[PDB]
Protein backbone atom coordinates (compact mmCIF):
# COMPACT_ATOMS: atom_id res chain seq x y z
CA UNK A 1 0.00 0.00 0.00
CA UNK A 2 1.06 3.59 -0.79
CA UNK A 3 -0.74 6.88 -1.41
CA UNK A 4 0.66 9.58 -3.72
CA UNK A 5 -0.42 13.00 -4.92
CA UNK A 6 -1.52 13.37 -8.56
CA UNK A 7 -1.46 16.26 -11.08
CA UNK A 8 -4.60 17.63 -9.42
CA UNK A 9 -4.83 19.03 -5.87
CA UNK A 10 -6.12 16.82 -3.05
CA UNK A 11 -6.58 13.81 -5.37
CA UNK A 12 -4.45 10.78 -4.72
CA UNK A 13 -3.74 7.25 -6.02
CA UNK A 14 -3.32 3.99 -4.16
CA UNK A 15 -0.89 1.26 -4.79
CA UNK A 16 -2.57 -1.74 -3.13
CA UNK A 17 -1.55 -4.97 -1.34
CA UNK A 18 -2.21 -6.82 -4.69
CA UNK A 19 -1.40 -4.21 -7.39
CA UNK A 20 -4.62 -2.35 -8.10
CA UNK A 21 -4.67 1.38 -8.48
CA UNK A 22 -7.57 3.46 -7.34
CA UNK A 23 -8.28 7.16 -7.02
CA UNK A 24 -9.14 8.51 -3.59
CA UNK A 25 -9.57 11.72 -1.64
CA UNK A 26 -8.53 12.99 1.75
CA UNK A 27 -11.42 12.23 4.08
CA UNK A 28 -12.85 15.40 5.59
CA UNK A 29 -14.90 13.42 8.14
CA UNK A 30 -12.76 10.46 9.37
CA UNK A 31 -14.18 7.04 10.23
CA UNK A 32 -17.32 7.80 8.20
CA UNK A 33 -18.28 6.70 4.71
CA UNK A 34 -21.12 8.13 2.56
CA UNK A 35 -21.79 5.17 0.19
CA UNK A 36 -20.00 1.86 0.70
CA UNK A 37 -16.47 3.07 -0.01
CA UNK A 38 -13.31 1.66 1.55
CA UNK A 39 -11.59 3.69 4.25
CA UNK A 40 -7.79 3.40 4.16
CA UNK A 41 -5.08 4.76 6.46
CA UNK A 42 -1.57 5.62 5.12
CA UNK A 43 1.03 7.65 7.05
CA UNK A 44 -1.76 8.13 9.62
CA UNK A 45 -4.07 9.89 7.11
CA UNK A 46 -7.52 8.56 6.23
CA UNK A 47 -8.51 8.43 2.56
CA UNK A 48 -11.82 7.56 0.90
CA UNK A 49 -11.66 5.21 -2.06
CA UNK A 50 -13.19 7.08 -5.04
CA UNK A 51 -15.07 4.71 -7.34
CA UNK A 52 -14.92 5.78 -11.02
CA UNK A 53 -17.83 3.60 -12.07
CA UNK A 54 -20.05 5.47 -9.57
CA UNK A 55 -18.78 9.00 -9.83
CA UNK A 56 -18.54 10.62 -13.27
CA UNK A 57 -15.93 13.10 -12.02
CA UNK A 58 -13.51 10.36 -10.93
CA UNK A 59 -14.47 8.62 -14.13
CA UNK A 60 -13.38 11.61 -16.20
CA UNK A 61 -10.00 11.84 -14.48
CA UNK A 62 -9.10 8.27 -15.43
CA UNK A 63 -10.24 8.94 -18.97
CA UNK A 64 -7.71 11.79 -19.11
CA UNK A 65 -9.13 15.08 -17.85
CA UNK A 66 -6.15 17.39 -18.39
CA UNK A 67 -7.02 20.01 -15.77
CA UNK A 68 -9.38 20.10 -12.81
CA UNK A 69 -10.94 23.48 -12.13
CA UNK A 70 -12.16 22.02 -8.83
CA UNK A 71 -9.39 22.34 -6.30
CA UNK A 72 -8.67 23.64 -2.78
CA UNK A 73 -11.05 26.33 -1.57
CA UNK A 74 -13.02 26.41 -4.83
CA UNK A 75 -16.59 27.56 -4.59
CA UNK A 76 -18.64 25.20 -6.77
CA UNK A 77 -22.35 25.04 -7.74
CA UNK A 78 -23.48 21.47 -8.16
CA UNK A 79 -26.59 20.83 -10.24
CA UNK A 80 -27.95 17.37 -9.51
CA UNK A 81 -26.41 16.30 -6.20
CA UNK A 82 -28.56 13.15 -5.83
CA UNK A 83 -27.66 10.80 -2.93
CA UNK A 84 -24.37 12.59 -2.48
CA UNK A 85 -21.80 10.23 -3.99
CA UNK A 86 -19.79 12.60 -6.20
CA UNK A 87 -20.37 15.79 -4.23
CA UNK A 88 -18.96 14.21 -1.06
CA UNK A 89 -15.65 13.76 -2.90
CA UNK A 90 -15.65 17.35 -4.14
CA UNK A 91 -16.28 18.13 -0.49
CA UNK A 92 -13.02 16.31 0.37
CA UNK A 93 -11.23 18.31 -2.35
CA UNK A 94 -12.44 21.90 -1.70
CA UNK A 95 -11.96 21.49 2.06
CA UNK A 96 -13.97 23.82 4.37
CA UNK A 97 -12.51 26.98 2.84
CA UNK A 98 -14.25 25.92 -0.31
CA UNK A 99 -17.99 25.58 -0.62
CA UNK A 100 -20.15 23.06 -2.42
CA UNK A 101 -23.74 24.24 -3.07
CA UNK A 102 -25.85 21.18 -3.90
CA UNK A 103 -28.98 21.59 -6.00
CA UNK A 104 -31.32 18.60 -6.28
CA UNK A 105 -35.13 18.40 -6.72
CA UNK A 106 -36.01 14.82 -5.88
CA UNK A 107 -37.17 14.52 -2.29
CA UNK A 108 -36.65 10.77 -2.11
CA UNK A 109 -32.92 11.29 -2.70
CA UNK A 110 -32.30 14.68 -0.99
CA UNK A 111 -33.55 12.64 1.98
CA UNK A 112 -30.19 10.94 2.00
CA UNK A 113 -28.16 13.90 0.72
CA UNK A 114 -29.19 15.55 3.96
CA UNK A 115 -27.25 12.94 5.89
CA UNK A 116 -24.12 13.67 3.91
CA UNK A 117 -24.50 17.42 4.51
CA UNK A 118 -24.91 17.26 8.31
CA UNK A 119 -21.48 15.65 8.63
CA UNK A 120 -19.90 18.22 6.21
CA UNK A 121 -20.07 22.03 6.90
CA UNK A 122 -18.68 22.02 3.44
CA UNK A 123 -21.99 21.25 1.66
CA UNK A 124 -25.24 23.21 1.27
CA UNK A 125 -28.13 21.00 0.09
CA UNK A 126 -30.80 22.81 -1.80
CA UNK A 127 -34.06 21.06 -2.51
CA UNK A 128 -34.78 23.01 -5.68
CA UNK A 129 -35.41 22.82 -9.43
CA UNK A 130 -32.31 23.75 -11.44
CA UNK A 131 -34.70 25.18 -14.07
CA UNK A 132 -35.54 27.99 -11.66
CA UNK A 133 -32.27 29.40 -10.29
CA UNK A 134 -34.39 32.23 -8.85
CA UNK A 135 -35.52 29.83 -6.08
CA UNK A 136 -32.04 29.43 -4.60
CA UNK A 137 -30.74 32.78 -5.79
CA UNK A 138 -31.29 34.10 -2.34
CA UNK A 139 -29.02 31.67 -0.47
CA UNK A 140 -26.02 31.05 -2.64
CA UNK A 141 -23.18 33.22 -3.93
CA UNK A 142 -21.30 33.32 -7.19
CA UNK A 143 -18.91 30.45 -7.71
CA UNK A 144 -15.70 29.42 -9.44
CA UNK A 145 -16.86 26.06 -10.89
CA UNK A 146 -20.28 25.12 -12.33
CA UNK A 147 -20.60 21.31 -12.16
CA UNK A 148 -23.71 20.04 -13.94
CA UNK A 149 -24.95 16.44 -13.87
CA UNK A 150 -28.76 16.43 -14.45
CA UNK A 151 -30.97 14.13 -16.42
CA UNK A 152 -33.25 16.55 -18.33
CA UNK A 153 -33.59 16.75 -22.10
CA UNK A 154 -32.82 20.50 -21.92
CA UNK A 155 -29.84 19.95 -19.58
CA UNK A 156 -27.39 22.14 -21.48
CA UNK A 157 -29.75 25.10 -21.59
CA UNK A 158 -30.37 24.63 -17.85
CA UNK A 159 -26.63 24.71 -17.31
CA UNK A 160 -26.35 27.94 -19.30
CA UNK A 161 -29.20 29.71 -17.51
CA UNK A 162 -27.56 28.82 -14.24
CA UNK A 163 -24.20 30.12 -15.44
CA UNK A 164 -25.29 33.65 -16.26
CA UNK A 165 -26.73 33.75 -12.75
CA UNK A 166 -23.88 32.27 -10.71
CA UNK A 167 -20.81 31.54 -12.82
CA UNK A 168 -17.93 34.01 -12.36
CA UNK A 169 -16.56 35.31 -15.69
CA UNK A 170 -13.58 33.17 -16.82
CA UNK A 171 -14.89 30.47 -14.50
CA UNK A 172 -15.23 26.81 -15.53
CA UNK A 173 -18.20 24.57 -16.24
CA UNK A 174 -18.11 20.79 -16.03
CA UNK A 175 -21.10 19.55 -18.00
CA UNK A 176 -22.10 15.92 -18.14
CA UNK A 177 -23.82 15.10 -21.46
CA UNK A 178 -26.32 12.29 -20.89
CA UNK A 179 -27.12 11.26 -24.44
CA UNK A 180 -29.90 8.79 -23.68
CA UNK A 181 -31.82 11.33 -21.61
CA UNK A 182 -31.68 13.89 -24.35
CA UNK A 183 -32.85 11.53 -27.10
CA UNK A 184 -32.75 7.73 -27.06
CA UNK A 185 -33.38 7.65 -30.81
CA UNK A 186 -30.48 9.82 -31.92
CA UNK A 187 -26.85 8.70 -31.95
CA UNK A 188 -24.89 9.75 -28.84
CA UNK A 189 -22.11 11.20 -30.99
CA UNK A 190 -24.63 13.50 -32.77
CA UNK A 191 -25.85 14.65 -29.40
CA UNK A 192 -22.36 15.42 -28.09
CA UNK A 193 -21.80 17.46 -31.21
CA UNK A 194 -25.00 19.49 -31.29
CA UNK A 195 -24.90 20.23 -27.54
CA UNK A 196 -21.33 21.60 -27.49
CA UNK A 197 -22.61 23.86 -30.31
CA UNK A 198 -25.14 25.20 -27.77
CA UNK A 199 -22.20 25.92 -25.47
CA UNK A 200 -20.22 27.76 -28.10
CA UNK A 201 -23.13 29.89 -29.26
CA UNK A 202 -23.49 30.89 -25.62
CA UNK A 203 -19.83 31.90 -25.65
CA UNK A 204 -18.44 29.01 -23.66
CA UNK A 205 -14.98 28.17 -24.85
CA UNK A 206 -14.71 24.37 -25.26
CA UNK A 207 -11.56 23.34 -23.35
CA UNK A 208 -11.83 19.53 -23.44
CA UNK A 209 -14.28 16.71 -24.24
CA UNK A 210 -14.11 13.34 -22.53
CA UNK A 211 -16.01 10.18 -23.35
CA UNK A 212 -16.80 8.32 -20.10
CA UNK A 213 -17.00 4.74 -21.56
CA UNK A 214 -16.78 2.12 -19.91
CA UNK A 215 -17.40 3.81 -16.57
CA UNK A 216 -20.64 5.22 -17.96
CA UNK A 217 -22.27 4.28 -21.29
CA UNK A 218 -23.54 7.01 -23.65
CA UNK A 219 -22.08 9.82 -21.55
CA UNK A 220 -19.61 12.54 -22.40
CA UNK A 221 -18.31 15.34 -20.21
CA UNK A 222 -17.40 18.89 -21.21
CA UNK A 223 -14.90 21.23 -19.59
CA UNK A 224 -15.20 24.85 -20.76
CA UNK A 225 -14.67 28.48 -19.67
CA UNK A 226 -17.41 31.07 -19.34
CA UNK A 227 -16.77 34.41 -21.04
Amino acid sequence: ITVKQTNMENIYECEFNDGSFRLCTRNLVPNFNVYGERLIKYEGVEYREWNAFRSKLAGAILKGLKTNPIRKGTKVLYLGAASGTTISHVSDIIELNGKAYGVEFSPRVVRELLLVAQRRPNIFPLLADARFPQSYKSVVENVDVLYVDIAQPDQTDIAIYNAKFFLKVNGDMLLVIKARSIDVTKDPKEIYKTEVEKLENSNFETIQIINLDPYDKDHAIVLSKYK
Binding site: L114, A117, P121, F124, P125, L126, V139
Partner: peptide, 16 residues
Protein backbone atom coordinates in the same frame (compact mmCIF):
# COMPACT_ATOMS: atom_id res chain seq x y z
CA UNK B 1 -20.96 30.16 6.65
CA UNK B 2 -21.83 28.22 9.82
CA UNK B 3 -25.15 30.03 9.93
CA UNK B 4 -25.79 29.67 6.22
CA UNK B 5 -25.02 26.00 6.53
CA UNK B 6 -27.46 25.47 9.34
CA UNK B 7 -30.02 27.56 7.52
CA UNK B 8 -29.84 25.31 4.47
CA UNK B 9 -30.35 22.21 6.58
CA UNK B 10 -33.45 23.81 8.11
CA UNK B 11 -34.73 25.26 4.89
CA UNK B 12 -34.62 21.98 2.99
CA UNK B 13 -35.67 19.89 5.99
CA UNK B 14 -38.74 22.09 5.96
CA UNK B 15 -39.45 21.58 2.24
CA UNK B 16 -38.80 17.87 2.53
Amino acid sequence: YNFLHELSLEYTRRKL
